[PDB]
Design a protein around this ligand. Sequence first.
Ligand SMILES: Nc1ncnc2c1ncn2[C@@H]1O[C@H](COP(=O)(O)OP(=O)(O)OP(=O)(O)O)[C@@H](O)[C@H]1O
Ligand SMILES: Nc1ncnc2c1ncn2[C@@H]1O[C@H](COP(=O)(O)OP(=O)(O)OP(=O)(O)O)[C@@H](O)[C@H]1O
Ligand SMILES: [Mg+2]
Ligand SMILES: [Mg+2]
Ligand SMILES: [Mg+2]
Ligand SMILES: [Mg+2]
Ligand SMILES: [Mg+2]
Ligand SMILES: [Mg+2]
Ligand SMILES: [Mg+2]
Ligand SMILES: [Mg+2]
Ligand SMILES: [Mg+2]
Ligand SMILES: [Mg+2]
Ligand SMILES: [Mg+2]
Ligand SMILES: [Mg+2]
Ligand SMILES: [Mg+2]
Ligand SMILES: [Mg+2]
Ligand SMILES: [Mg+2]
Ligand SMILES: [Mg+2]
Ligand SMILES: [Mg+2]
Ligand SMILES: [Mg+2]
Ligand SMILES: [Mg+2]
Ligand SMILES: [Mg+2]
Ligand SMILES: [Mg+2]
Ligand SMILES: [Mg+2]
Ligand SMILES: [Mg+2]
Ligand code: NA
Ligand code: NA
Length: 551
Amino acid sequence: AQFVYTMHRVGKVVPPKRHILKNISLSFFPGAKIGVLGLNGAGKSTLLRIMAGIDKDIEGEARPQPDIKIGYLPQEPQLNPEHTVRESIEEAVSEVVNALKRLDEVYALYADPDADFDKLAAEQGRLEEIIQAHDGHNLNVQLERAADALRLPDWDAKIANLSGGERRRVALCRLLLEKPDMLLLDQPTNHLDAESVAWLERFLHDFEGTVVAITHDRYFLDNVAGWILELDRGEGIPWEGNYSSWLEQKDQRLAQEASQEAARRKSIEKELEWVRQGTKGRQSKGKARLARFEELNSTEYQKRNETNELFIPPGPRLGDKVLEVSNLRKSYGDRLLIDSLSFSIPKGAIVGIIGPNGAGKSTLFRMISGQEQPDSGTITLGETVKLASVDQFRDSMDNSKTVWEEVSGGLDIMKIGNTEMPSRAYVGRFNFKGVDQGKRVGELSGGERGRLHLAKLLQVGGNMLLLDQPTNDLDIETLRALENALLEFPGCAMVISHDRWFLDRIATHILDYQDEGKVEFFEGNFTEYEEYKKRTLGADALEPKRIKYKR
RNA sequence: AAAGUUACA
RNA sequence: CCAUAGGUUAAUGAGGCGAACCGGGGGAACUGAAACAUCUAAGUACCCCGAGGAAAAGAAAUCAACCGAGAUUCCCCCAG
RNA sequence: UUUUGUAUAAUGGGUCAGCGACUUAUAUUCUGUAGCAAGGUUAACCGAAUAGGGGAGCCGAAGGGAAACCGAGUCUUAACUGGGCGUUAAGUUGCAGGGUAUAGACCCGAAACCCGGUGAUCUAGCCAUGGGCAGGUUGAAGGUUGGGUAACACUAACUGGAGGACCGAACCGACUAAUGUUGAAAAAUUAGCGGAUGACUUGUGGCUGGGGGUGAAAGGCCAAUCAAACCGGGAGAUAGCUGGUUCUCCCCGAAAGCUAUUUAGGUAGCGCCUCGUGAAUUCAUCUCCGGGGGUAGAGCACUGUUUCGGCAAGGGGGUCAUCCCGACUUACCAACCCGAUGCAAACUGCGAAUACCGGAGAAUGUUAUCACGGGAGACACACGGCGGGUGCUAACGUCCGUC
RNA sequence: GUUUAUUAAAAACACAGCACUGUGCAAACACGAAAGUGGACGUAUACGGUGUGACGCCUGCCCGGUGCCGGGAGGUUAAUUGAUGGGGUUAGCGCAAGCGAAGCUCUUGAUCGAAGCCCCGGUAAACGGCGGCCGUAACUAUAACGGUCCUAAGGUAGCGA
RNA sequence: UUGAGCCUUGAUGUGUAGGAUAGGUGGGAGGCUUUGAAGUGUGGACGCCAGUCUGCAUGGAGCCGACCUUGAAAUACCACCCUUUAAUGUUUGAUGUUCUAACGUUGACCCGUAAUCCGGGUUGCGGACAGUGUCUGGUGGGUAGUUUGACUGGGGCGGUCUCCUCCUAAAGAGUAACGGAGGAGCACGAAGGUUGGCUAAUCCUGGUCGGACAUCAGGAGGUUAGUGCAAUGGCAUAAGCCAGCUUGACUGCGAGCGUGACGGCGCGAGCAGGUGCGAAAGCAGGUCAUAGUGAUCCGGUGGUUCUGAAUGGAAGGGCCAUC
RNA sequence: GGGUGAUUAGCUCAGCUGGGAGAGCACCUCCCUAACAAGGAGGGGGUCGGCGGUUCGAUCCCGUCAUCACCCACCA
Ligand SMILES: Nc1ncnc2c1ncn2[C@@H]1O[C@H](COP(=O)(O)OP(=O)(O)OP(=O)(O)O)[C@@H](O)[C@H]1O
Ligand SMILES: Nc1ncnc2c1ncn2[C@@H]1O[C@H](COP(=O)(O)OP(=O)(O)OP(=O)(O)O)[C@@H](O)[C@H]1O
Ligand SMILES: [Mg+2]
Ligand SMILES: [Mg+2]
Ligand SMILES: [Mg+2]
Ligand SMILES: [Mg+2]
Ligand SMILES: [Mg+2]
Ligand SMILES: [Mg+2]
Ligand SMILES: [Mg+2]
Ligand SMILES: [Mg+2]
Ligand SMILES: [Mg+2]
Ligand SMILES: [Mg+2]
Ligand SMILES: [Mg+2]
Ligand SMILES: [Mg+2]
Ligand SMILES: [Mg+2]
Ligand SMILES: [Mg+2]
Ligand SMILES: [Mg+2]
Ligand SMILES: [Mg+2]
Ligand SMILES: [Mg+2]
Ligand SMILES: [Mg+2]
Ligand SMILES: [Mg+2]
Ligand SMILES: [Mg+2]
Ligand SMILES: [Mg+2]
Ligand SMILES: [Mg+2]
Ligand SMILES: [Mg+2]
Ligand code: NA
Ligand code: NA
């Protein structure tokens, strides 16, 4: 069984001397499915950037087999805002389109005999060969089939005027149109809804080539992965099994490491007590034991686990009238997202906003924050309400600035409502508890980017929160910390998310989008929402179709 | 399940 | 009945000793390195086996450089 | 002899006579001398063999560059106005001598390491075999006969003769003292002392052998030797350590410092010594001239420390609305400004004498100066004067500078 | 009883007794390149090693450390095997460049890979270990008692200048 | 019993539009089935739930193309086929059980032989285990060879060991002590280069929250400030502070010096080539200076046909830059 | 004589090359109770040993002294 990829002694060093990856020796075999786990900063995206060939700085040797295609989807897929849907899409088939245009230019040869045959007719064969390498002529059908299978927006739509989920779908389609042999995915379900994620995971299970996927979720991982690469601090640990068994193994590993560190502390204290005694005569003391103690005094890497410190500052006191919408309606062109929506938000409530992609979830936040003007108006907030909004996109932070400068603005004392707070203490409240204040925004990882985003955008101190997909790149630990912080909140919050479990653990009012632009509002949590649906239900259970890619 | 004590004419 | 091992009798040799030299089987350490462990001393001292008047080697599956020389051994250079 | 320094009460020598320590291979550099000279010279070897042949070679006349390569030039560099190394000075082979290298390498001297053998006639254990233990005590089990008991159990007397049992000779030891310590004796004698039928003692003969044995275990014993026997060899181990180093005269004449050191008592480069060669009013002294100081002394503008006055903010405890504006007390702690007065290695708005650096001028001085080359020794210093650190303004203390 | 022949005869060694442990016999163990011997012409009521040391009353708590015993799941892991990638050479395609078949080579090293170690239990007549500070009762004299920190556990019986 | 691979035989391929599950080109015409059907009843499998594939039963001659309005055409073969899958083979690999014939036997019997040695022969029992050889991981004071620094008011213990600043240090340099005080093992693509511009600390007076001290205004003062970090020396022409443009934090050299015992270290005008700033004169080969460090060996990386053990390459060397 | 460590609320102790400074029980009030204990609710405390120092911060960093706790004083 010839492998597909190999890494031997692969090591990476980041600023100062930090071995994110140390001695990672691995082989990737045909038909494999690997899920890469770890905390927010472990080095998963680093390892995939190495596997994509983008990073060659590493120590060791990492290489794929020759003439195998690696399709790399990062966790920051960039697209051309000028481009429309088709203008961004065809770049994945640009060879065929460019060659076809060249054929159109060449066809004037047989009209005008200028440099007739010995100069370009021979190259016409090379052009027809590059068409033949693909289907080429039946290309519009390929594009239509891909768009149908991935539920892409119509090609006339622009890219800036696109929802985050559909943006990720465009990136997925442009990646998979290349038709590679090894997929590298960096959180491929970042902004996807339930149907999109289910289709993607079925496709991944069907994929013939190798798949290496980074995921902070567990159910999609149980679906797709064949084995897990833990990727702890420094070292990568393979594992055969499911997420819960791997979790058990991980707790056992961390408990053993904690016990060994405690024993090390014990032995070091004992030997220090020995070192701090006198010679007692003209006898040994001994340099061998001194050397043993000096080498025993070493350094161990503590886990940079976020855990429960996510600091949501308390806003101003909130009256009973918080938010009210009456007959809200919004449409774009001919497709309408919200139609005759009315609801009131009692104080203290967490509102789980759910629905498919581009259904209007983010545009609702735009109206509430006042950046968009509804057709049917009647959005209102109580006079005590102070709004703090967290966007679906992090594209507002200066990647040059450091963490502390970007969060705090450079002022040593930070004002949060009534109380002045030390900026360094406030930043450290968001797990940047060391010299992590010095890291650059661009050099931060995706999960650290989300944490810094929350830190910068919760400082306004509003007692109404408008969080749009707040747990995008976060792992389970930061997710739990955020859930606890949201629970210990005096004000009220509206959270848009696609994590059903995270939304269920905190939501008190469900705002769910449906077809034909109806936004059903339900006061209650997800358990009683499901119970209400069961009480007044409809008889069927089959959502998907799982269309195809090939042919 | 827990439930101790509290000087006399 | 086999046959072999074994036994018996003959003839034929060799045993042991000896100074060095010679071929082989094993093979130190002190010392030097200003310590020492790679390294050196040194394949030396020593032990053992086997010859001979010498012994070993010896007649290219050797060198050399498109010219060539022609088995082995020893001496002087090459060259510290 | 060793030392800073010895009559030293530090070492060595009783004395005589004899012996006793810088040698010999090669190789290399320098000096003298001899021969030839841009040449000199052969080695092995042949040889009627100190000749004569033999020129294989070696050194020299050309260097530069890592090299290719170029060449009285070359290298560097894109190139050098450049710069480094060379060109404008004879070598070579003997002989004698001074060094160095390898050999024991000036002589003597370890404790040790390795190799091969000799030892269990001493002593450790064990094995086979066969001897020794005067004399006297105590009385175990068991047994018998009676009492007993249903039978036992038990009990008495008699018996019996156990025991790493008791006392004590031979025998085996070795606790105490004295003597003896160039002894009667390289461990004993004398007077006492312990065991003395046992894990005893003893004869003869065996067996275990050196990182091995044996050990009722002390590192004990293994031929008067044992934390690794003895004999022979490697072997003249090695010894930065000690000792010793032998005839005479003449000339010059040190150092005990710096730097480095697995280095401090060793060594290396430099300083200082000597010999040779070559060179300049080269060097030294004094006079004059041109310089830089930040020392002694002094001073208090600076950094600090100080006293005393005069102005005096502020600061600490009471008299009050023991919140405000503070409204009033210091026989005041107190730097800030001024007037006086001190102190300072790490203070300076000042500042010598000397010393040092350079120039000129004589006189004087066996060139005293510098460079190169051969040979060293020395790198433990001592005290005294002057300037100081340290110490106690101690030390024949210790550490620097200078004489 | 033994011991430092030759300054130590003792409280030292031994000892009967005790315990732990190994050992199923071609025993463990020891001497020995080996053969083979002892153990033993014995056979777990036997033999070896270790500690303690008649007898009497006893021998408390700690398995965290070191060792030993058991476990096998997972991790790390040797020699082996030599996939894969890279390079050297060159028949040719080019005779300007450069590429490069087959072979042969240099290197790199996928896959396979046991015991140990990590890990999980046990074991102290295995080697070993067996706490602080503060307050508190008719005098502060002391604390039966209490608070708290730490530990693997905090020294029990009995002895004690 | 399995694991893996390979060859066959099957089975399988729901987009939209389309008659309805359409893999790809085919390449061709009609074949299929009658060697018994286009079906009904029945059983399993797949099932993107439409459905097409299937073992059967009497009945056994009709299903699609061809026709085209779809990007494409009609399981209407064998294909070498792609995708998944399942079966018999095939190799191999693992584990297990049985066997005997290697091997063991310190079981019995027989012979050599008048011998509990040894050998041979029968037989029993184990048995490809055990055991040994080579290679290899672990353990291994059982044994062996060694190491285990120096200074030091004796040694040990404590402290120190390299570099920078001041004093000791005696007005040139240098100058010791286990003398007296402190620091370094870096920082900076600006905090470097230039060209312009600018001048502090502290105090007094007036001024909204606002005072002992924030920002403002004017007066004294005159560097008591500042310098990336110790101390010393220096700095107004600022070496201090601000801004524009920038990369001289250049490459090859280098008269001449200073300082070292040397290794080495430092300063440097000027020359050549290119550059930045400035209108120019000019300045710039790092930073106000003095700390911020490590010889050689060995090896790594890039460049250079300098070398290349017959020749052409190459390996390995050298040179340059660097780790 | 030399060396080391500790100092944090009333007590015993945790405390990030910074971030009012924390835990048990003590203390305060209120419930519960005839009344106390125990139990339950609320609450407050601080020289971070002290003058010192590179610092965006000194509790943890920064020489020192103050005290109590140790350790060593060997050949001699
Ligand atoms: N140049 C850099 N210098 C210093 N730290 C860096 C640099 N680049 C990245 N890092 C750090 O390396 C860490 C690893 O980041 P990385 O993106 O690999 O993590 P991740 O686990 O893959 O993230 P995520 O799951 O959130 O996408 C982060 O903490 C990041 O800040
Ligand atoms: N300016 C616009 N013109 C046209 N269409 C627009 C415009 N802005 C947004 N849309 C579209 O309208 C829909 C609204 O989507 P929106 O960004 O509000 O979030 P969502 O789709 O509800 O959520 P999510 O961000 O999670 O996908 C999307 O389909 C989006 O592409
Ligand atoms: Mg040796
Ligand atoms: Mg030596
Ligand atoms: Mg030695
Ligand atoms: Mg022959
Ligand atoms: Mg006398
Ligand atoms: Mg004398
Ligand atoms: Mg001569
Ligand atoms: Mg003998
Ligand atoms: Mg007597
Ligand atoms: Mg005898
Ligand atoms: Mg011997
Ligand atoms: Mg001898
Ligand atoms: Mg020798
Ligand atoms: Mg004289
Ligand atoms: Mg010396
Ligand atoms: Mg002196
Ligand atoms: Mg244990
Ligand atoms: Mg085990
Ligand atoms: Mg040893
Ligand atoms: Mg200027
Ligand atoms: Mg220039
Ligand atoms: Mg210009
Ligand atoms: Mg080369
Ligand atoms: Na990532
Ligand atoms: Na959106």
